[PDB]
Amino acid sequence: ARYTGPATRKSRRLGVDLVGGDQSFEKRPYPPGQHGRARIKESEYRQQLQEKQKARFSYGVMEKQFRRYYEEANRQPGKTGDNLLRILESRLDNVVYRAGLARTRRMARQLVSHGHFLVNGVKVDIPSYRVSQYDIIDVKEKSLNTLPFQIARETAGERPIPSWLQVVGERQRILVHQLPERAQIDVPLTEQLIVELYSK
Amino acid sequence: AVKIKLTRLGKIRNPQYRIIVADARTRRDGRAIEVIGRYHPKEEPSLIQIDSERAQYWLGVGAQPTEPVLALLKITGDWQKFKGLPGAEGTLKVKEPKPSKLDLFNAALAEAE
RNA sequence: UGGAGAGUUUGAUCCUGGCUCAGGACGAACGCUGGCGGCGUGCUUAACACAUGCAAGUCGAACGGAAAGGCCCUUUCGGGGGUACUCGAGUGGCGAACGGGUGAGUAACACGUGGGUGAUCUGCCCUGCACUUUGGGAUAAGCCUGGGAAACUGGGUCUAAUACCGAAUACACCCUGCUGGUCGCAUGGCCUGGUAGGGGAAAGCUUUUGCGGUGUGGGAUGGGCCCGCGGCCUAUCAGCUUGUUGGUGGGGUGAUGGCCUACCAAGGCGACGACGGGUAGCCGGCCUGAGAGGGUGACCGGCCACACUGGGACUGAGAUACGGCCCAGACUCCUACGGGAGGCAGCAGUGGGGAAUAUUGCACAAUGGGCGCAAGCCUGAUGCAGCGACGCCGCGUGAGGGAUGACGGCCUUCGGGUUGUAAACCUCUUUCAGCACAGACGAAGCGCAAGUGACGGUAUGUGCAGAAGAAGGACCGGCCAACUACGUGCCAGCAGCCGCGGUAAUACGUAGGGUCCGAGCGUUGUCCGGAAUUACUGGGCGUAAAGAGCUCGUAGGUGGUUUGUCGCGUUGUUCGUGAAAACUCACAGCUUAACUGUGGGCGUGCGGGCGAUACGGGCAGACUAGAGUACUGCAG
C-alpha cells in the first residue's frame, strides 16, 4: 500500500521537518492532537522507534519493506547504518527527487509509478527500483512536454545535485557514477539508533 | 538403457533444461548419473552448452539421446563427430554479447559534451 | 558474522527461586475487514466407506485372416466377389515390476555415511568374435454344435507363424579327472594355462534410410547380499535363547549363510541394559538460536514399506505384482438360489469425521516414458488453467498549490485549542482497474507434409476518458509508541502478569484524539528464544533444593620421575567420496522483488597413501619423593 494521509502530522510528531520547506511545521513544531503539548517520558525505545519512523516516512517505505532493507544491509560486508542509508538512497524515486526533477518525494514517486521515466532504455514504473552504477535514467519522449517536467527543467537552482548523481542533458538525463557513501548522503536522523532498534 | 535426457528446471513460465545422463526407468526429475550441459530455449538464440568429451564418452558406452537431445547434439556437432559423416562442425549460434554498461556511460557523457 | 531485558515474595533490602511478558515461525484455524498482480501452496483428522468418468498400451515390416472404412470388378439394388491400401476380434512379441498414491506397519542393516563381494545376478543399449543347419506335431481364430439366468464354458472339424518340439553344429561356454605356472587376503583367484571325457542354440520378415534371431568376450546401467559407525523413551521390563550357538555331510539359491535338513558338541546374548513395554517411516533439509544445542520431516529431492484384511505362489531379466492370479475373511451388489461380481492410500468427485484443506477443467504444443522401421498411437506422468488473502513479494487507492486556518465534532480555565494542508477550491498526472486496436516467446522443435501452441487472443504494446472505481484492524496504567470527556459504581465488565470496577475510572462501555501496522489486522493452537531454568560451551550442594549414617570393596574412571620403541588417539598434507536441490558469496534473467539460472564456497564426516612424535595410550625397561613392609620406641 501507501501512506496518503496528511504529511505535516508525521513531521509534527517526529519533531523534525521531513518535507523540507513546509511552513505549517514551523508554525507549530509540536506533536498533533489534543495532547501535543504534554511532556513525554524519556525512553531509549521511544527514541529508536522515532528515528526509524523518521527514516521510513521520509522515503515513504512501509515497515515490511524497511525490514527487508535492514536485513539486506546487515548482511552486506560494510557497516549496517550507512549500508541501510545507501540502500534507501538508491531507490528510483529518491534518485528522481535528489536529481532536482521533483519538488517532493511524493511527487517523484507518483511520476515514477505512472511510468514517466525510463531506465537503461526500458520502461520502468517501480518506485522501489534500485539503481546501480552507470545507470542512465531518461524521461520518455511523450511526457517531455508535460508541465511537471517543464517546471522541473526550468527551476534547476534548488537543492544541489549530490556528487554521486549528475544531470547531463538539457532533456534532464540522469547519470549515476557510483552508489553514494555516507559522507555524501546528507540525510537527517541517526542510523545507529535504527540499528539498535532492529537488534532488540 | 541409459539415455541422455532433458530434465526441467526454472519457474512456471520459463523452462530451463539440464542435459543429464540417466537410466530410462527413472522419472524426469529423478537422480542423474551426470550433468553434461544445459539448454535454455526461452532466449532469442536459445543458449546451448554441451560438454563435448563427456558427451563423447557417454555416446561411446552406448547412451541413447532423446529427440531434443539428438537435435542439440547435431547442432553442436558432437553427434557428427561421434558418427563421422560430414565432419565435426560447430553450428552453434552463440548469443551476441551486449556492450558494457561503462561503454554506454562514457558514450552518454561524451554525447553530453 | 556475533548474546538487550521487564514485572512479581518484603514495612524496606540483598540473594535464591519459580511464574509471566516483549521476538521468530506455520501445510494452520477463527473474528473483523478486503483492490490487483507475480510466484508458490491446499485432508495435518477416518490406511473410513465409496456413485460416475478417465489413469497401459502398442506392433499388419511375426501370423492365419477379412468384421469396419478405401479401391476395383458385378449385378435383380438384394447384394455379390477380389484387393490388401487398411483393419474389429484372435494367435504371437514387447510393455505392463516404470511412472502416479499413501505413511498403516517397521526401533529394523529400514535409513544416513563408509566399505566388502576370492560369495553374486543384470531384459532393452554399445562394442568384438562365431553362427543363423535340419525335421515334425499341434492349436487359437474360422465353421458346426451343446450347457448356463448370468458370469462363463464343453464337444467335433479346420488353419498359420519369429507360437511349440526333435536332431546336427559351437568347443568362445557348462560339468568332471589329471596336470603347469603365478598372485595372494585363508577358503582361494588369475593365466579365455594345458590336457582327457561328456554336453549345451537360433527365425525370419521387408524393398526401404530396411528391420530382425542364437551363442560367446568386454563395456554401460540397474540391482542383490554382508559389515563398521550414527540418530527415541522406558528396570515401577533382569534374566533371554533350543535351529538357539558352532561343526560335518547333504539340500537349496544368482550368491554366502541354521536359509533348510540329519547327526554331533553345548553353546550364544545381557547391567556397555539383553528380553519386554511405548512411541515412530529414515534422510537431504526446515524452523529457532550468537553458537553449542532444541523442535521438526509440510512442498521439492533420495531410500524403505504397503495397495480392503491375512496367507500363497505363478509368469518373467526384474514382482509389496495399486488398476494380475489362487485361497480364507469382513463388507457391498446381481441371481431363475444352482451360482456369480467388486476393491480411489491414481486424477477429479461423493458421503462421513473434523476447527480445517480445492475442479467430476484443457492439452499431448514442451519434457519424460511404452510399442512401432517409420508415419503414428497411448500417457489424470507432465505442461497449463479454475477455486481459497493460505504464504512470500510487488503495486494502487492520487500529486503540487491551498488559511490569522471554513462547517461540524471534541475539549475548555468560555479566552481559545484540536481534528487541520486536513477539507472546500485551482492546476497536474494517470500507475492498477474500464473501453478500443494490434499481439507474442516458449518450436535451430515435430512432419516429408504444407502444416503444427493447451496456455491464449492471454502476457504485452499503443491509443481514449476522467481523480475519476479502490482502507481497514488492533491498541493507548506499567512492561510497551500512544489521553481526555461522558455513562456505570465491588455492578456491568476487563485482564498476559501486576491487578482495575465504592457517583468525580488515563485499566469497564461509548465518543473525540493519538499511536502501530496496513490488504491486511488481531485471537487461539504448536515449536525455538528470552531460560545460565539440565549449565559441553555454561549452574550448583554449611544455613536457600541438594554430601548416602560410616566403611570395605567389584566393574569402571583416573594416575609420580625417567629411557627406547609403535604411530592407536592427536596433528599436517594429498587422493576418493560427501547426488541435485537447499544455505552462503558473486554474476546474470525476468520492468523491480519474490522467483529462476550459472560459478565458487559449504557439504563440519568417512575411507586410502605419505609426514611428525610434544602430549595421551600400548610395548620393553629403570628410579624412589607416593604407597606398603621391617626394626626400635610411644600414648590411648
The three cell numbers locating residue B37: 550441459
Nucleotide showing the shortest C1' distance to residue A46 CA: C481
CA distance B12 to chain A (A): 23
The three cell numbers locating residue A88: 534507501
Give which of A104, A91, A177 is closest to A136, Cα–Cα.
Answer: A177
CA B22 to C1' C255 (Å) is: 28
H-helix or E-strand spanning residue B5: strand B2-10
φ, ψ at A91 (rounded to 5°): -65, 150
Are residues A149 and A83 located together in one domain of the fold?
no
Domain-wise residue ranges, chain B: 1-95
In chain B, what residues touch A173 (CB-CB under 8 Å)? 108, 112
Are residues A79 and A126 located together in one domain of the fold?
no
Longest dimension (CA), chain B: 67
Burial A100-125 (b: 16+ CB within 10 A, else e): bbbbebbbbbbbbeeebbbbeeeeee
Are residues A86 and A114 located together in one domain of the fold?
no
Distance set, CA A63 to CA A11, A73, A75, B81 (Å)? 18, 15, 18, 60
Total structural domains in chain A? Answer: 2
**Which residue in B102, B104, B113 has the most chain A C-beta atoms within 10 A of its own C-beta, making it the best mutation to test that interface?**
B104
Give which of A39, A49, A56 is closest to A3, Cα–Cα.
Answer: A56
Are residues A56 and A1 located together in one domain of the fold?
yes
- Sign of the C-alpha dihedral, residues B26, B32, B36, B39? positive
Strands across the sheet containing A136-139: A122-123, A117-119, A136-139, A174-176, A165-167
Nucleotide showing the shortest C1' distance to residue A126 CA: C592
Q: What is the resolution of this structure in A?
A: 2.8
B98 touches strand C (CB under 7 A): yes
Contact A134 B112 (CB under 8 A): no
Contact B102 A136 (CB under 8 A): no
Nearest chain B residue to A169 by CA: give it.
B112
A153 touches strand C (CB under 7 A): no
Give which of B81, B30, B31 is closest to B60, Cα–Cα.
Answer: B81
* CA B72/CA B66 separation, integer angstroms: 10
Neighbouring CB atoms inside 10 A of B21's CB total 21
- DSSP 8-state code for residue B41: T
B102 touches strand C (CB under 7 A): no
Are residues A57 and A1 located together in one domain of the fold?
yes
- Give residues with Cβ within 8 angstroms of A125, minimum separation 6: A112, A113, A114, A115, A117
φ, ψ at B19 (rounded to 5°): -85, 100
CB A11 within 8 A of CB A22: yes
In chain A, what residues touch B108 (CB-CB under 8 Å)? 136, 168, 173, 175
Can you give the three-state secondary structure of chain A, one letter per residue?
A: CCCCCCCHHHHHHHCCCCCCCCHHHHHCCCCCCCCCCCCCCCCHHHHHHHHHHHHHHHCCCCHHHHHHHHHHHHHCCCCHHHHHHHHHHCEHHHHHHHHHHCCCHHHHHHHHHCCCEEECCEECCCCCCECCCCCEEEECHHHHHCHHHHHHHCCCCCCCCCCCEEECCCCCCEEECCCCCHHHHCCCCCHHHHHHHHCC
Q: What residue has cell string 528515528?
A: A51
**Which 36-65 residues of chain B approach strand C with CB closer than 7 Å?**
38, 40-42, 44-46, 48, 60-64
- Give residues with Cβ within 8 angstroms of A47, minimum separation 6: A193
Dihedral (Cα; A20, A26, A30, A35), 10-degree rounding:
-120
φ, ψ at A166 (rounded to 5°): -165, 120
Strand partners, B18: B7, B38
Burial A21-45 (b: 16+ CB within 10 A, else e): eeeebeeeeeeeeeeeeeeeeeeee
CA A25 to C1' C425 (Å) is: 23
Distance set, CA B68 to CA A3, B4, B28, B72 (Å)? 53, 10, 14, 6
Are residues A133 and A54 located together in one domain of the fold?
no
The three cell numbers locating residue B43: 532466449
Contact status of B105 with chain A (Cβ, < 8 Å): yes
CB A60 within 8 A of CB A105: yes
CATH number at residue A131: 3.10.290.10
The three cell numbers locating residue A89: 538512497
Are residues A18 and A102 located together in one domain of the fold?
no
Q: What residue has cell string 536485513?
A: A71
Give the amino acid at A34. Q
Contact status of B1 with chain A (Cβ, < 8 Å): no
Domain ranges, residue A110: 92-185
CA distance B110 to chain A (A): 10
H-helix or E-strand spanning residue B103: helix B101-112
B88 touches strand C (CB under 7 A): no
- DSSP 8-state code for residue B13: S
Give which of A196, A194, A199 is closest to A61, Cα–Cα.
Answer: A194
Are residues A75 and A146 located together in one domain of the fold?
no
Nearest to B102 among A134, A169, A173 (CB): A134
Are residues A50 and A109 located together in one domain of the fold?
no
Are residues A69 and A147 located together in one domain of the fold?
no
A115 touches strand C (CB under 7 A): yes
